[PDB]
Amino acid sequence: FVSPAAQKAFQPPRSC
Amino acid sequence: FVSPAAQKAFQPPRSC
Amino acid sequence: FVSPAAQKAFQPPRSC
Amino acid sequence: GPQPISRLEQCGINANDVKKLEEAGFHTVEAVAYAPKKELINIKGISEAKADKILAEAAKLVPMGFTTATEFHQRRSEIIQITTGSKELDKLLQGGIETGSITEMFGEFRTGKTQICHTLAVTCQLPIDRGGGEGKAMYIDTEGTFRPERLLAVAERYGLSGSDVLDNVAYARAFNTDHQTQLLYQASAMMVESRYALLIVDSATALYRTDYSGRGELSARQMHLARFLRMLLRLADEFGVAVVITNQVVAQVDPKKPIGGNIIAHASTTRLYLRKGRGETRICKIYDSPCLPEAEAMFAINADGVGDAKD
Amino acid sequence: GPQPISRLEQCGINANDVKKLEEAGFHTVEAVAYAPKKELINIKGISEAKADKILAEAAKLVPMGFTTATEFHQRRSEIIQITTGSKELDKLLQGGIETGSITEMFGEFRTGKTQICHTLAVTCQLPIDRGGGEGKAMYIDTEGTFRPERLLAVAERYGLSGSDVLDNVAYARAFNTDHQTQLLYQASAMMVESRYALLIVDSATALYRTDYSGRGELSARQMHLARFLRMLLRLADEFGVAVVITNQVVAQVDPKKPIGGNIIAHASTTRLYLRKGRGETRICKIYDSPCLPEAEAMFAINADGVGDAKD
Amino acid sequence: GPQPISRLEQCGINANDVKKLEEAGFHTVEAVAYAPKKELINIKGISEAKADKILAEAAKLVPMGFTTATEFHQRRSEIIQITTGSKELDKLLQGGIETGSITEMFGEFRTGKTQICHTLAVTCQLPIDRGGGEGKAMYIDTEGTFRPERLLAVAERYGLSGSDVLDNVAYARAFNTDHQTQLLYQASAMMVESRYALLIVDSATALYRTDYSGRGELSARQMHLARFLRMLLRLADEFGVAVVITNQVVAQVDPKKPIGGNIIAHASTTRLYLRKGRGETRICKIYDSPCLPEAEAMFAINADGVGDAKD
Ligand SMILES: Nc1ncnc2c1ncn2[C@@H]1O[C@H](COP(=O)(O)OP(=O)(O)OP(=O)(O)O)[C@@H](O)[C@H]1O
Ligand SMILES: Nc1ncnc2c1ncn2[C@@H]1O[C@H](COP(=O)(O)OP(=O)(O)OP(=O)(O)O)[C@@H](O)[C@H]1O
Ligand SMILES: Nc1ncnc2c1ncn2[C@@H]1O[C@H](COP(=O)(O)OP(=O)(O)OP(=O)(O)O)[C@@H](O)[C@H]1O
Ligand SMILES: [Ca+2]
Ligand SMILES: [Ca+2]
Ligand SMILES: [Ca+2]
Ligand SMILES: [Ca+2]
Ligand SMILES: [Ca+2]
Ligand SMILES: [Ca+2]
């Protein structure tokens, strides 16, 4: 299957 | 085969 | 081969 | 991006057939266009009449004809090259790991194959300005050596939200060679939704040494491996991701050539041979490439991922 | 824990087939899920129709798809790391011997390989609070060097009922390479009943030097060793135990590399190289690991098992 | 004791095959049980069908499965430890030379290797009350240094019929490395009839220095030595005798390590390093052992065999 978070789209990794 | 004691389940080792 | 004495069985060593 | 297969219904294809195609792995118009007539026939609810219609309609949506080297040199100059996290190593690859192609990294144990895959799985999310791919990563692992704590260590180096980076790595543990191929069909589905920029199979040939034993199973081993490597090449054309497979080695007793035989030597476009240097340094070497010259570079494994020789 | 294979009958599998599976080594649903279609075909009373049914039903019971590194970093942070009985050594391994993976300990003679396996066979029964695994131990021994009096000496150190500790160590003496593999099939049965937390094969490659003589039998030697190491990896995934194999060494006359070749170098995830220090001190060294940095520690063999350098 | 191979006929084995097995070295059911399937195939009148039958039937007669450390600690506590004729030395070995295992005694010249083997060849016949083995001795000698007058001198010390003691020592002079191995096949036959309690090969590696010359014959030298040491380990399990091999030394010019390389270092369970003390005193030292701590003792060679430092 697909995870409920793997189906989420890409997110530009915020800095830290 | 299996020993009559190897088939026994785990036992938390008591202190001494 | 085997010796005529090597084929002989064990003997408890007698005291002296 | 790639056109989703739903665009075939708007061209005169029964929406039932699209469902019969999507149950066979095809999710984009490209996947159906690049497919041979033989594959569509092998589908149950598809006949030679439909397959000729499906191929004809799909061919109209994607260019499958001649062009010029000028029009290709233009389209190629805009290709993404993901950085390896090492200035010395990227200068060897003339940019970095190239997308739209299969790259292979083989070598003895400890030579940093899994470590490069962890660095790549992070740097593929940097903005293209910083040398990345601005996409998710997909890490198929056939050994059980995927360590998330090594991704956090690299995110700290590039100053990224370690919690956000681990959300862009779709991890999957393959347990045999059949499961390893099954994961690619599910992979083609995910890449239609999100935007993955790097596919990693490490190791690509680990499970082929044991599932197929002696020489008696050699023929079946390579034909099964050839379909896998072919199915990767299809993902590299469908979605333009970067396929980076790792390979084990074997001694020649007649001094370490990679396994897989000629099936994996021809299929992969770039081959990197990783030696053991000194201490924490390693030596990568362009073993085979269409464009890059044969040369060696020296990188190292540091506490913050793969980086230049910190010496 | 792992689901027993009896749960397949409740999903539409003939209870006769489950008996035909359990006669082939499979005892958990995982063992059947992770198995390739090829292995189930090789069973007599199983056909391609049944095997496709068995694989399909079993796949529904165990996750074999993609997840996220976030969901994997969570599940991994709850993994058990068994202490080695040495504060200096655990600080090298960042916790201790990690479960769910194959660990290898090689070195010259006397370097404490068998001694570490005896300490591990005891400390794997301590509560997790004290750094153990709260499970039984399984000590396959291919040399005849299993000494129970060395387990009692370690139980006295940790204050355990020496009579109770020896009840949690399932000992088995392998006499050749075929018998060594046969013991693993019987091992998969026992781990379903009890709760074993540590598997020890010492030495894993001792019997491969003599059963397979020269180079003429080299190919068959590694293919037989590859199946063994693969069958261990399956136990590490089925039951999540900790596999700790020991390896002999060989000189290179062209200065001591471990035997087994590339087959055992790729298969094992963590390799520990044990040198001889001074007196009773020894020097372990992270030879290969996916996460741990290359570093050395100094432990010692004491009258109460492996412990820190008592100096 | 060990079951003779004739008990296989009563379980459905052709008495012709038993004769074909006994012509291959196997004389006990154990020897056939511990044997791999590969060895039985290498026999002429044996096929894969028979060998699978032979292995299956023999496995029913001898336990080859798991037990518990408790059941093993019990069975081990009743093991025989032959005295070395020295109170100071037995206190080092915690009892004496242990049966069912391979013990190695190496050192420079004159250090008393052959002298210990002569004392052991006598004290192995004392009743267990007095610390012996109540069995015959088998003294394979590859140097020509077997002196019966040294056995009489020890029999006088323990008050034994010197004429009767010399009847319990089966002496054999090996003239090359092939003959040295051939003597072990004949040795397995004798131990079925009588009751031998000690096997002595002195020196085990004397003939390997000269029969195999330079480095060009190094690989073949160790593989031939590995089979010999393996065939000794089989005798220690078949009959539970005590194998006490002696080893020469070699200087390292880069200060005296034993020869044989890693092949003999891993195979032997207990290694005793004998130095030269002062006058007639010598210094033994636990070089390697699974259970004994690293320590030194001081014995001496006296006119009545090996004894304590008479000072
Ligand atoms: N955090 C770290 N810091 C420094 N060095 C590390 C770190 N983690 C691993 N290493 C080193 O990197 C090497 C491991 O490399 P890697 O995991 O890529 O191996 P590999 O080529 O995949 O091997 P195999 O074939 O066994 O899977 C070892 O030398 C190890 O000591
Ligand atoms: N009870 C003990 N107390 C102290 N030291 C001991 C004790 N038992 C064994 N030793 C020491 O530990 C070492 C033996 O280590 P170990 O049995 O692990 O060897 P190994 O690496 O398995 O060797 P091999 O390849 O020969 O099997 C020797 O130095 C021996 O003197
Ligand atoms: N009857 C005896 N009384 C006292 N000392 C003796 C007697 N016989 C031999 N020795 C001494 O014992 C030593 C010989 O030891 P041994 O024969 O065991 O040598 P080794 O270690 O086998 O040597 P090599 O490698 O040359 O064979 C010498 O010091 C010799 O003087
Ligand atoms: Ca790896
Ligand atoms: Ca190529
Ligand atoms: Ca050992
Ligand atoms: Ca490895
Ligand atoms: Ca001598
Ligand atoms: Ca040893």
Numbering used by the authors:
A (entry chain N), B (entry chain O), C (entry chain P): 3289 to 3304
D (entry chain G), E (entry chain F), F (entry chain E): 21 to 274, 283 to 339
Sentences from the paper on this structure:
The BRCA2 tumour suppressor protein preserves genomic integrity via interactions with the DNA-strand exchange RAD51 protein in homology-directed repair. The RAD51-binding TR2 motif at the BRCA2 C-terminus is essential for protection and restart of stalled replication forks. Here we used cryo-electron microscopy and structure-guided mutagenesis to elucidate the mechanism of TR2 binding to nucleoprotein filaments of human RAD51. We find that TR2 binds across the protomer interface in the filament, acting as a brace for adjacent RAD51 molecules.
We obtained RAD51 NPF structures on both ss- and dsDNA with bound TR2, which showed clear density attributable to the TR2 peptide. TR2 decorates the outside surface of the filament, binding across adjacent RAD51 protomers. BRCA2 residues 3289 to 3304 could be modelled in the map at the TR2-RAD51 interface, with no appreciable difference in binding mode between filaments on ss- and dsDNA. BRCA2 TR2 adopts a bipartite mode of binding to the RAD51 filament. TR2 residues 3296-KAFQPPR-3302 bind in extended conformation to an exposed groove on the surface of RAD51 ATPase domain that includes the acidic-patch helix. The polar side chains of K3296, Q3299 and R3302 project towards the acidic patch, forming a basic stripe that complements the charge of RAD51 D184 and D187. TR2 amino acids 3289 to 3295 extend beyond the acidic-patch groove and reach the protomer interface, to interact with the adjacent RAD51 molecule in the filament. Residues 3292-PAAQ-3295 fold in a single-turn alpha helix that packs against RAD51’s inter-domain linker sequence, shielding the RAD51 residues that mediate self-association between protomers in the filament. We were unable to detect additional density for TR2 in the vicinity of either ss- or dsDNA, indicating that RAD51-bound TR2 does not engage with DNA within the same filament. Our results provide a rationale for the biochemical observation that BRCA2 TR2 stabilises the RAD51 NPF, as TR2 binding across the protomer interface acts as a molecular brace for the association of juxtaposed protomers in the filament.
